[PDB]
């Protein structure tokens, strides 16, 4: 029917909920043209595999998602991040197929979960590699009060500050929409900048790297100059490592700032109102007081909470923090910082 604008009071933000989608779900929103195409070839992507990725590990299910997450821990805003049904959608090599699937995903998550329960709302997958489609689906649905962000991936064919993606950024914030980039495989390059990892420790910890490279590119691209309006977030990427990254950027900039004579501000200054970060999975330093220290060294105003329901490495909404974590800041990432990012009114 019609929705209210997202309302945050009293209650906590979860910037990363992964809804559990059933098989017979996206076909009502999928033209036959693609249904038999998936029958014949499946969703080809950057692998040589038919089903798996590179590194392989109310009603329908609303109730299990309302009961043991949205009620268990008092969650009042949960942001819906659907990769794809049963391997992310926008990374399919057939980009026309990819667009149809996010089209279907967007329709379904709206029609089936956020409207039945406006506590949740959605970040819309778009084809970040065919910007024509990204802008087209932003205009299609990003006007809905049921859309709260654009959803991209940590891995892309070019760094996120490249100008291939600038058509998507205007579209996105010409709709007053922030963009989240969620941890991802594929993209077109190896796991690391120096090869494919072998063991699961390298794979899982390697996810941090792609975020480092994306942050640097977004800042030194001048992207947040040409888009002073733009607010982007890094999800399932581990907040703590960002602070020495940001620190090293500034220290190198001081010497080499002349290569980029257009970058209005000093790189770390761009963080203020452009770079947020989800908290899951929570960083666990050996001395637990380093966490708060590192959190505000990045930025205390730009860290949003997340569970990653229903993933195995989910964080209990307050067993996640260590012994004497600063209460002011815990409160700011549970409520205030997410509020700020998604653009709800105080």
């Amino acid at each position: 029917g019609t929705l209210p604008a997202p309302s945050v009071t009293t209650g906590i933000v979860d910037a990363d909920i992964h809804p559990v989608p059933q098989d017979g779900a996206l076909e009502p929103y999928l033209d036959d043209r693609w249904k038999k195409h998936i029958r014949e070839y499946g969703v080809r992507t950057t692998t040589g595999l038919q089903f798996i990725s590179e590194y392989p590990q109310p009603g329908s299910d609303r109730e299990l998602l309302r009961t043991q997450l949205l009620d268990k821990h008092n969650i009042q805003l949960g942001v819906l991040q659907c990769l794809a049904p049963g391997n992310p959608a926008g990374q399919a090599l057939n980009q026309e197929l990819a667009a149809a699937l996010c089209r279907a995903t967007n329709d379904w998550q709206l029609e089936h979960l956020v409207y039945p329960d406006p506590r949740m709302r959605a970040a819309i997958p778009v084809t970040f590699e065919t910007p024509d489609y990204a802008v087209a689906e932003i205009e299609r649905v990003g006007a809905d009060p049921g859309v709260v962000a654009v959803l991209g991936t940590s891995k892309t064919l070019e760094p996120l500050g490249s100008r291939k993606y600038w058509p998507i950024y205007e579209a996105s914030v010409a709709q007053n929409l922030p963009i989240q980039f969620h941890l991802s495989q594929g993209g077109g390059h190896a796991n690391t900048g120096t090869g494919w990892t072998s063991y699961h420790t390298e794979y899982h910890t390697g996810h941090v790297q792609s975020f480092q490279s994306q942050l640097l590119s977004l800042v030194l691209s001048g992207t947040f100059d040409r888009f002073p309006t733009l607010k982007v977030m890094f999800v399932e990427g581990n907040v703590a490592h960002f602070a020495p990254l940001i620190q090293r950027m500034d220290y190198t900039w001081e010497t080499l700032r002349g290569e980029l004579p257009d970058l209005q501000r000093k790189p770390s200054e761009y963080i203020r109102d452009h770079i947020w970060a989800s908290t899951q999975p929570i960083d666990e330093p050996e001395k637990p007081e380093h966490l708060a220290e590192l959190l505000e060294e990045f930025c205390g105003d730009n860290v949003v909470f997340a569970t990653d329901y229903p993933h195995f490495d989910f964080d209990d909404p307050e067993t996640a923090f260590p012994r004497s974590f600063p209460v002011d800041l815990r409160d700011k990432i549970l409520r205030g910082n997410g509020m700020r990012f998604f653009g709800v009114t105080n």
Binding site: P159, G193, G206, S213, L220, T255
Partner: protein, 354 residues
């Protein structure tokens, strides 16, 4: 017997031109050089005319370049009398030669150049061994060849490899380093046989330079996960000119997921926290803001070891902070002693001479 010396663990020789190797190559490769009108494999890691390339104060040569002769490096590095020994790294990109037997041959000529024209000239210099990464069994053979000359004190490797250094393919290098009692150093720079990030080519050299800390995380994760530190338990790894503030967040996630996936790498019995603190060392230049007040004492808290940091000036590169401003970051004399002399004694056993 001895007191550990002040060792600068990262200073640089700059090959004047690809012609400086002509004396050291076979007749066959030599003719090839003068016949190819000598393509220079000078890297872009520190661009010739960028701000990081060299100091304003630096003694320069005929063409205005610093660090092309030992006479010029020695005159600057040892001026104030505080340094006892310096570790020379020559970054000329033989590693980016695609022809395998040329990579082999220039690497050895390069090392002959270092020995005869730098090490022979000042008993105060030491060097790393440039090795043909393209062909690891040949890189191991290059290591064996110079194992005799104990003026060569570590094995040089680029931060960005072709395959991660933990892959079986790369084991001969670690075996050879172990056999020769030599640390392996990873110095910033790369072979560029893939995009230098997981998400493509960085547009600016400033982006590349800062971002190269991501690849080192990948390499340590690789080296340790695949089990280099159990096959070759005497291994020492020095991270040269790559920052160090990124380590504690990295190590904490490694430890967290090690604990999660222990049966996947069942040869890794100690924690990668303990492993990294024992086996990995890192140079101080650039300090990346650790020179700022209090920051250096704090980073050793987050690293949880005072044995890791080893002193370097990165001569002749220009950084925001200078070699000794590292002192403005700690109120701990005992920690400065560890950085300036004691931690590098783990790498090289260099005591103060007379």
């Amino acid at each position: 017997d001895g007191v550990p010396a002040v060792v600068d663990c990262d200073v640089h020789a700059v090959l004047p031109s690809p012609h400086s190797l002509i004396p050291y190559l076979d007749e066959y490769w030599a003719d090839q050089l003068v016949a190819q009108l000598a393509p220079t494999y000078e890297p872009n890691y520190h661009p010739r005319g960028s701000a990081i390339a060299q100091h304003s104060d630096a003694s320069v040569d005929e063409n205005g370049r610093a660090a092309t002769t030992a006479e010029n490096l020695v005159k600057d590095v040892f001026a104030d009398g505080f340094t006892d020994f310096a570790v020379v790294n020559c970054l000329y990109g033989v590693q980016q030669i695609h022809q395998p037997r040329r990579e082999m041959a220039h690497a050895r000529a390069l090392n002959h150049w270092i020995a005869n024209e730098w090490l022979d000239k000042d008993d105060r210099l030491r060097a790393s061994i440039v090795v043909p990464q393209g062909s690891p069994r040949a890189a191991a053979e290059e290591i064996d060849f110079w194992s005799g000359d104990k003026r060569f004190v570590q094995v040089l490797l680029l931060g960005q490899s072709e395959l991660l250094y933990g892959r079986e393919i790369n084991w001969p290098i670690w075996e050879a380093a172990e056999a020769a009692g030599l640390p392996v150093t990873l110095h910033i720079g790369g072979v560029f046989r893939q995009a230098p990030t997981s998400v493509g080519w960085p547009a600016s050299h400033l982006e590349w330079y800062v971002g190269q800390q991501s690849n080192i995380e990948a390499q340590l994760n690789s080296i340790i996960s695949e089990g280099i530190l159990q096959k070759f338990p005497k291994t020492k790894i020095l991270l040269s000119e790559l920052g160090f503030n990124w380590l504690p967040p990295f190590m904490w996630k490694f430890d967290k997921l090690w604990k999660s996936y222990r049966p996947d790498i069942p040869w890794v019995q100690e924690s990668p926290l303990e492993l990294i603190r024992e086996h990995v060392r890192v140079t101080t230049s650039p300090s990346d803001g650790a020179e700022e007040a209090g920051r250096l004492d704090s980073i050793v808290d987050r690293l949880g070891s005072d044995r890791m940091l080893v002193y370097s000036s990165d001569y002749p590169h220009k950084h925001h902070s200078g070699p000794r401003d590292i002192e403005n970051g700690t109120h701990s004399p005992e920690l400065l002693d560890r950085i300036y002399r004691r931690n590098a004694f783990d790498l090289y056993n260099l005591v103060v001479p007379s």
